[PDB]
Amino acid sequence: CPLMVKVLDAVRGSPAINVAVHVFRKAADDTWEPFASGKTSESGELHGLTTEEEFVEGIYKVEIDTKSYWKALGISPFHEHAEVVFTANDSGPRRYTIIALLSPYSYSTTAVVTNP
Amino acid sequence: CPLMVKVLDAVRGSPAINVAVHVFRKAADDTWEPFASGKTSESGELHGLTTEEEFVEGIYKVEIDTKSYWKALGISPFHEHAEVVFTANDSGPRRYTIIALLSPYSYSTTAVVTNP
Amino acid sequence: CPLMVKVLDAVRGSPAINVAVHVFRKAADDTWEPFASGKTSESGELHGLTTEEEFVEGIYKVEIDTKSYWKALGISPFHEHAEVVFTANDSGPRRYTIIALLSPYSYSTTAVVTNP
Amino acid sequence: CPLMVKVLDAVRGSPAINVAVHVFRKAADDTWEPFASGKTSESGELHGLTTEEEFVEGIYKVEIDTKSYWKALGISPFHEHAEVVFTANDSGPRRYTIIALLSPYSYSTTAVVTNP
């Protein structure tokens, strides 16, 4: 599983459940092509977005729909979404975990990149 | 000054100087129309992007060129850039300060919103 | 496993391996009594600090020796250590994960608290 | 002003006003000797804790009373407080700004260190 997204709610100290996540990949013509999507589970994780074979080198964008998460809790948050844009697999295949820590007016994003 | 951006370097413990910042407004056809830009000063701040008159309600994107900053320091970074997207002035004009705390494989973006 | 500590290096985008962690509990006389200790594994996690039965209500302090981690990498970091002080189990037993994200001049700490 | 503390509220998007801050210096017997204190202003800042003459080399602890702040807002917090511990002036006198970004179950502390 080479791309995993984990989303945590820093207000409640809990996984952020049912958060929509959309992944895009930059094409040769420079547009953003839809690549995969999903929602976070009860553990705040989203697995199974892609496979080692499909996840070739390229520039990827992960957009996490944090506004709908907060709005469902009654909150009008600052960000429309939490983004992550990155070059993947430049020196060969790696496994990427994207960790997003969410608050209504702040978000932090961290990548843990490992080599199997 | 309705929009200010402050960028800090968590590796060196310093303002992040000469970071390029580009601001866009979402156009009616959902494309991003570039609005303003500048580079952070010696205190890591960027002032004067826009004015109260021009900064009408809408959705804005602030792109911070973090990859160029880390490259200039000789440090391998994860992200292409950091993209803060937010709806402005939804309840009246506000002053926004966006604080970006940078590390090579992690960053956080926080908004401090005050009502003049 | 009711107390778990996970430590990540935000510079390299990796688990922070072999980081010493000391846990203390406030006694009735208000001193800090040593409670458990350990080091993070290859995954940056430290499991097995305590048991559900031993981990009674109280105020706990987790001190993560981040200075030795950075010094071994050649870096003189800002913090002497990363602390976490918290009341545990006030409304009954819970499971606590403490996530520390480390940079030489910044650290973030987040608690994920769940109810089995 | 060799030591300043700035505290921000990630839930409301604002300076964290009237937060108590206590500074200690480690004594020769390893006890913490309280040094100075104050509360953050309307801009979330606390200036004037110490002076260049008094702020000699040593190990300092800054305790930020985050639990009282969250209680005053009616929000359940995780931590008892946030404790930033650092060695000061090891390579000569520096000006330190400690920035604390607060959420109820997460916080980060960053130092901006500049040489006058």
Residue numbers in the entry:
A (entry chain A), B (entry chain B), C (entry chain A), D (entry chain B): 10 to 125
Show sentences the authors wrote.
TTR is a homotetrameric plasma protein that carries L-thyroxine (T4)8 and vitamin A910. The TTR molecule is composed of four identical 127 amino acid subunits, named A, B, C and D. Each monomer consists of eight strands in a β-pleated sheet conformation. The weaker dimer-dimer interface defines two, largely unoccupied, funnel-shaped T4-binding sites. Pathogenic mutations affect the native TTR stability, facilitating the dissociation of the tetramer into monomers that, upon partial unfolding, aggregate into amyloid fibrils.
Because the filling of the cavity with additional hydrophobic chemical groups has been reported to increase TTR stability, we decided to test whether introducing four additional methylene groups by mutating Ala 108 into Ile would result in a denser packing of the T4-binding channel and, accordingly, in an over-stabilized protein variant. The modelled TTR A108I variant was predicted to be more stable than A108V by FoldX, with a ΔΔG of 13.71 kcal.mol−1 relative to TTR WT. We engineered a novel TTR A108I variant to attain an optimal packing of the hydrophobic residues in the T4-binding cavity, as confirmed in the crystal structure. This designed protein becomes one of the most stable TTR variants described so far, at the cost of being unable to bind the T4 hormone. The stabilization promoted by the A108I mutation is even more dramatic, since this variant begins to unfold only above 8 M urea and its tetrameric structure seems to be essentially intact even at 9 M of the chaotropic agent. To dissect unambiguously the molecular details accounting for the higher stability of the natural and designed TTR variants, we solved the crystal structures of both TTR A108V and TTR A108I homotetramers at 1.3 and 1.4 Å resolution, respectively. Regarding to the tetrameric assemblies, the major finding on the TTR A108V and TTR A108I structures is a significant reduction of the volume of the ligand-binding hydrophobic cavity and the formation of a few novel interactions, namely between side chains of Val/Ile108 and Leu110 (3.80 Å), between Val/Ile108 and Thr106 (3.95 Å) inside the same monomer, and between Ile108 and Leu17Symm (3.58 Å). In addition to the formation of these novel interactions, it is remarkable the reduction of the hydrophobic cavity that binds T4 and other hydrophobic compounds, which is partially occupied in our TTR variants by the aliphatic side chains of Val108 or Ile108, leading to formation of a much closer AC/BD interface in the tetrameric assembly. These different interfaces in the TTR variants result in the decrease of the distance between the methyl groups of Cδ1 of Leu17Symm with Cβ2 of Ala108 (at 7.80 Å distance), with Cγ2 of Val108 (at 4.25 Å distance), and with Cδ1 of Ile108 (at 3.58 Å distance).
